Design an enzyme around this catalytic site. Structure first.
Site, PDB file in Angstrom:
ATOM      1  N   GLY A 102      15.495  -6.991  71.823  1.00 17.28           N
ATOM      2  CA  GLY A 102      14.933  -5.701  71.435  1.00 17.28           C
ATOM      3  C   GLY A 102      13.606  -5.807  70.698  1.00 17.28           C
ATOM      4  O   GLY A 102      12.684  -5.027  70.951  1.00 17.28           O
ATOM      5  N   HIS A 134      12.259 -17.003  60.922  1.00 13.60           N
ATOM      6  CA  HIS A 134      12.473 -16.353  59.638  1.00 13.60           C
ATOM      7  C   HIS A 134      12.070 -17.257  58.485  1.00 13.60           C
ATOM      8  O   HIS A 134      11.402 -16.809  57.546  1.00 13.60           O
ATOM      9  CB  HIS A 134      13.945 -15.923  59.485  1.00 13.60           C
ATOM     10  CG  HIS A 134      14.360 -14.874  60.472  1.00 13.60           C
ATOM     11  ND1 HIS A 134      14.883 -13.657  60.092  1.00 13.60           N
ATOM     12  CD2 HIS A 134      14.314 -14.861  61.823  1.00 13.60           C
ATOM     13  CE1 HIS A 134      15.142 -12.940  61.171  1.00 13.60           C
ATOM     14  NE2 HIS A 134      14.799 -13.647  62.235  1.00 13.60           N
ATOM     15  N   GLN A 169       1.886 -24.666  66.626  1.00 15.46           N
ATOM     16  CA  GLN A 169       1.387 -23.528  67.391  1.00 15.46           C
ATOM     17  C   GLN A 169       0.214 -22.855  66.698  1.00 15.46           C
ATOM     18  O   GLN A 169      -0.806 -22.546  67.331  1.00 15.46           O
ATOM     19  CB  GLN A 169       2.499 -22.507  67.622  1.00 15.46           C
ATOM     20  CG  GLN A 169       1.954 -21.239  68.241  1.00 15.46           C
ATOM     21  CD  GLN A 169       3.027 -20.379  68.861  1.00 15.46           C
ATOM     22  OE1 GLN A 169       3.590 -20.752  69.886  1.00 15.46           O
ATOM     23  NE2 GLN A 169       3.304 -19.208  68.260  1.00 15.46           N
ATOM     24  N   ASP A 209      18.496 -11.825  54.770  1.00 19.32           N
ATOM     25  CA  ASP A 209      18.782 -11.387  56.135  1.00 19.32           C
ATOM     26  C   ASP A 209      20.289 -11.275  56.306  1.00 19.32           C
ATOM     27  O   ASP A 209      21.031 -12.107  55.773  1.00 19.32           O
ATOM     28  CB  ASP A 209      18.300 -12.423  57.177  1.00 19.32           C
ATOM     29  CG  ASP A 209      16.821 -12.327  57.495  1.00 19.32           C
ATOM     30  OD1 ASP A 209      16.334 -11.194  57.721  1.00 19.32           O
ATOM     31  OD2 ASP A 209      16.160 -13.404  57.547  1.00 19.32           O
TER      32      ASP A 209
HETATM   33  O1  LIG Z   1      15.996  -9.537  67.187  1.00 16.25           O
HETATM   34  C1  LIG Z   1      16.602  -8.850  66.327  1.00 16.25           C
HETATM   35  C2  LIG Z   1      16.791  -9.334  65.032  1.00 16.25           C
HETATM   36  O2  LIG Z   1      16.422 -10.631  64.732  1.00 16.25           O
HETATM   37  C3  LIG Z   1      16.876 -11.650  65.626  1.00 16.25           C
HETATM   38  O3  LIG Z   1      18.253 -11.529  65.957  1.00 16.25           O
HETATM   39  C4  LIG Z   1      18.639 -12.469  66.989  1.00 16.25           C
HETATM   40  C5  LIG Z   1      20.076 -12.184  67.373  1.00 16.25           C
HETATM   41  O4  LIG Z   1      20.180 -11.050  68.217  1.00 16.25           O
HETATM   42  C6  LIG Z   1      18.458 -13.885  66.474  1.00 16.25           C
HETATM   43  O5  LIG Z   1      18.780 -14.784  67.539  1.00 16.25           O
HETATM   44  C7  LIG Z   1      17.031 -14.112  65.996  1.00 16.25           C
HETATM   45  O6  LIG Z   1      16.953 -15.394  65.359  1.00 16.25           O
HETATM   46  C8  LIG Z   1      16.580 -13.015  65.026  1.00 16.25           C
HETATM   47  O7  LIG Z   1      15.182 -13.100  64.743  1.00 16.25           O
HETATM   48  C9  LIG Z   1      17.439  -8.552  64.089  1.00 16.25           C
HETATM   49  C10 LIG Z   1      17.663  -8.853  62.671  1.00 16.25           C
HETATM   50  C11 LIG Z   1      16.864  -9.758  61.971  1.00 16.25           C
HETATM   51  C12 LIG Z   1      17.062  -9.978  60.611  1.00 16.25           C
HETATM   52  C13 LIG Z   1      18.022  -9.256  59.926  1.00 16.25           C
HETATM   53  O8  LIG Z   1      18.225  -9.424  58.590  1.00 16.25           O
HETATM   54  C14 LIG Z   1      18.804  -8.317  60.603  1.00 16.25           C
HETATM   55  O9  LIG Z   1      19.759  -7.609  59.925  1.00 16.25           O
HETATM   56  C15 LIG Z   1      18.603  -8.101  61.952  1.00 16.25           C
HETATM   57  O10 LIG Z   1      17.836  -7.282  64.410  1.00 16.25           O
HETATM   58  C16 LIG Z   1      17.695  -6.770  65.662  1.00 16.25           C
HETATM   59  C17 LIG Z   1      18.197  -5.498  65.854  1.00 16.25           C
HETATM   60  C18 LIG Z   1      18.057  -4.958  67.126  1.00 16.25           C
HETATM   61  O11 LIG Z   1      18.564  -3.730  67.356  1.00 16.25           O
HETATM   62  C19 LIG Z   1      17.424  -5.655  68.165  1.00 16.25           C
HETATM   63  C20 LIG Z   1      16.937  -6.921  67.934  1.00 16.25           C
HETATM   64  O12 LIG Z   1      16.324  -7.594  68.933  1.00 16.25           O
HETATM   65  C21 LIG Z   1      17.064  -7.515  66.657  1.00 16.25           C
HETATM   66  O1  LIG Z   2       6.940 -25.300  69.160  1.00 14.72           O
HETATM   67  C1  LIG Z   2       6.839 -24.376  68.354  1.00 14.72           C
HETATM   68  C2  LIG Z   2       7.502 -23.107  68.446  1.00 14.72           C
HETATM   69  C3  LIG Z   2       7.302 -22.191  67.486  1.00 14.72           C
HETATM   70  N1  LIG Z   2       6.467 -22.411  66.415  1.00 14.72           N
HETATM   71  C4  LIG Z   2       6.318 -21.415  65.341  1.00 14.72           C
HETATM   72  O2  LIG Z   2       7.596 -20.868  65.113  1.00 14.72           O
HETATM   73  C5  LIG Z   2       7.489 -19.453  64.848  1.00 14.72           C
HETATM   74  C6  LIG Z   2       8.193 -18.742  65.970  1.00 14.72           C
HETATM   75  O3  LIG Z   2       8.348 -17.397  65.548  1.00 14.72           O
HETATM   76  P1  LIG Z   2       8.414 -16.232  66.630  1.00 14.72           P
HETATM   77  O4  LIG Z   2       8.928 -15.037  65.896  1.00 14.72           O
HETATM   78  O5  LIG Z   2       7.109 -16.118  67.348  1.00 14.72           O
HETATM   79  O6  LIG Z   2       9.454 -16.778  67.730  1.00 14.72           O
HETATM   80  P2  LIG Z   2      10.930 -17.456  67.817  1.00 14.72           P
HETATM   81  O7  LIG Z   2      10.712 -18.948  67.922  1.00 14.72           O
HETATM   82  O8  LIG Z   2      11.717 -17.049  66.587  1.00 14.72           O
HETATM   83  O9  LIG Z   2      11.509 -16.853  69.088  1.00 14.72           O
HETATM   84  C7  LIG Z   2       5.981 -19.161  64.765  1.00 14.72           C
HETATM   85  O10 LIG Z   2       5.523 -19.226  63.422  1.00 14.72           O
HETATM   86  C8  LIG Z   2       5.397 -20.247  65.675  1.00 14.72           C
HETATM   87  O11 LIG Z   2       4.069 -20.592  65.346  1.00 14.72           O
HETATM   88  C9  LIG Z   2       5.803 -23.611  66.252  1.00 14.72           C
HETATM   89  O12 LIG Z   2       5.060 -23.824  65.304  1.00 14.72           O
HETATM   90  N2  LIG Z   2       6.018 -24.523  67.253  1.00 14.72           N
END
Ligand SMILES: O=c1c(O[C@@H]2O[C@H](CO)[C@@H](O)[C@H](O)[C@H]2O)c(-c2ccc(O)c(O)c2)oc2cc(O)cc(O)c12
Ligand SMILES: O=c1ccn([C@@H]2O[C@H](COP(=O)(O)OP(=O)(O)O)[C@@H](O)[C@H]2O)c(=O)[nH]1
Length: 454
Positions: A370, A15, A331, A112
């Protein structure tokens, strides 16, 4: 006239990074950005601040919550099971958010998760803007009003079909719908069930926005605007901006030793740890391809080093053709390297964007989340830009042969499915990078933000 916007993203690099990419684009248009970040995390973010005279970081002290590991600030610092405690900690920044807003007085705050915020901003004459970097298809599927009104009557069978009015058709597997049916109810911070929290945010905010463009995200944003009756904006696809830090010489040197497009890059983001058995299947599957590979993975559950967890004889066999590495790497810069022919991705929204704008063939390995699953279905079945690795219908596990197969298909120049997904990826890349696509998204985005503060 330029806007003063505060940024309050969830405490996660997936985020923070796109919020910062978008902050740069807004500051290029003259907008002033107050970027709230966890205190220690700020140092890892300076990299991406391309407009330090318009984007100012304001540190937050991530407060103690019982069970939160000492000093933790981000989901990159804690196991996934500790996410809800980190949410409670976000919730507990309210007093230091309240005082930051009262002195900075932004016109709008992007946020968020913190559904208590729009009450504070309404008091201060600030507009609240819930800004998602996940797929609007995900929020539409799980958190639209028809889902919420079934309350605790929502079952796995319910989640196998889309909610009423959903604009699109795709298929979930049984274990996926079970996952969504159960995790939906689990508390995520301060006693609030996960989907109720996001629904509270959607319901109370002044306006909503998503990463995306009309051409792809359009139908879901339209559905959400119809359902919640308030503006649902699109920022554009948040094309990654260039970092001030060049590619680490150690990776540039090693990657440069391989033929163009021959290397398989595999990474599952920064929040997740595989279980050992799927760690083994994934790595053995990469090995079976015979291609060089770079796998960016945390040691599996129960293990503290990559070494200890590797399949027996793996190091000795793969020699210098393959590296398994647990540290944070650049990455975006690796995905741009000409050696990379294939990206095996967990389908995080940020990784999806970074693969789409590059030339790598996409292999889809969504992890149990999800947004990752819905991203994988859209990418595999609608855009058809990648091949998804098969999982067991009920157990959600994959075999080493299914990993091998998917990579082999996309890497084979003579395979028609591989040629198809390459062609479709090219079409999507040409759209996302079209000279006027992101700029006209941002044009509309900024006019609608101006309307919001009018
Ligand atoms: O992945 C989701 C999500 O963001 C993530 O929530 C994970 C926890 O569950 C975190 O661990 C990840 O850091 C975060 O990116 C969010 C979310 C992201 C930002 C927001 O401001 C919000 O209100 C919802 O919502 C979901 C809703 C769903 O029904 C299913 C999902 O998989 C998510
Ligand atoms: O070793 C790492 C792992 C992740 N990323 C960056 O971190 C973000 C990861 O976001 P994404 O939604 O793909 O996955 P998450 O890590 O939240 O599951 C992206 O901008 C990737 O390029 C990175 O630069 N190096």
């Amino acid at each position: 006239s330029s806007l003063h916007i505060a940024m309050f993203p969830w405490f996660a690099m997936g985020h923070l990074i796109p919020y910062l990419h978008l902050s740069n684009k807004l500051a290029k248009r003259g907008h002033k950005i107050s970027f709230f970040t966890p205190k220690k995390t700020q140092t890892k973010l300076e990299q991406f601040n391309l407009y330090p005279n318009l984007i100012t970081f304001y540190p937050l002290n991530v407060p103690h919550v019982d069970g939160l590991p000492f000093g933790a600030e981000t989901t990159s610092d804690v196991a996934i099971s500790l996410g809800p405690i980190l949410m409670t900690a976000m919730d507990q920044t309210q007093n230091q958010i309240e005082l930051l807003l009262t002195q900075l007085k932004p016109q709008i705050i992007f946020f968020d998760f913190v559904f208590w915020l729009p009450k504070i901003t309404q008091r201060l004459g600030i507009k609240s803007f819930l800004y998602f970097i996940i797929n609007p298809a995900t929020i539409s599927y799980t958190t639209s009003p028809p889902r919420m009104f079934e309350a605790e009557n929502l079952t796995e069978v319910d989640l196998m079909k889309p909610p009423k009015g959903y604009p699109t058709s795709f298929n979930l597997q049984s274990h996926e719908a079970k996952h969504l049916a159960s995790t939906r109810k689990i508390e995520f911070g301060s006693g609030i069930p996960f989907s109720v929290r996001s629904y509270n945010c959607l319901s109370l905010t002044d306006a909503i926005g998503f990463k995306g463009c009309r051409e792809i995200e359009g139908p879901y944003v339209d559905y959400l605007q119809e359902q919640f009756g308030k503006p649902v904006l699109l920022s554009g696809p948040v094309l990654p901006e260039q970092s001030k830090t060049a590619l680490d010489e150690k990776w540039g040197s090693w990657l440069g030793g391989f033929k163009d497009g021959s290397l398989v890059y595999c990474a599952l983001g920064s929040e997740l740890k595989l279980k050992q058995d799927q760690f083994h299947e994934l790595l053995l599957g990469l090995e079976l391809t015979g291609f060089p590979f770079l796998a960016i993975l945390k040691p599996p559950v129960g293990f503290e080093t990559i070494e200890d967890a590797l399949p027996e004889g793996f190091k000795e066999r793969v020699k210098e053709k393959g590296i398994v590495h647990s540290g944070w790497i650049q990455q975006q810069l690796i995905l741009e390297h000409p050696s990379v022919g294939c990206f095996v991705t967990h389908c995080g929204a940020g990784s999806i964007t970074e693969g789409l704008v590059n030339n790598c063939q996409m292999v889809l390995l969504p992890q149990l989340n999800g947004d990752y699953i819905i991203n994988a279905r859209i990418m595999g079945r609608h855009l058809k830009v990648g091949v998804e690795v098969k999982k067991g219908e009920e157990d959600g596990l994959f075999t080493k042969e299914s990993v091998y197969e998917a990579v082999k298909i996309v890497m084979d120049d003579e395979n028609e499915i591989g040629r198809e997904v390459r062609s479709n990826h090219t079409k999507v890349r040409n759209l996302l990078l079209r000279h006027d696509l992101e700029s006209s998204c941002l044009d509309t985005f900024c006019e609608k933000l101006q309307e919001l503060v009018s």
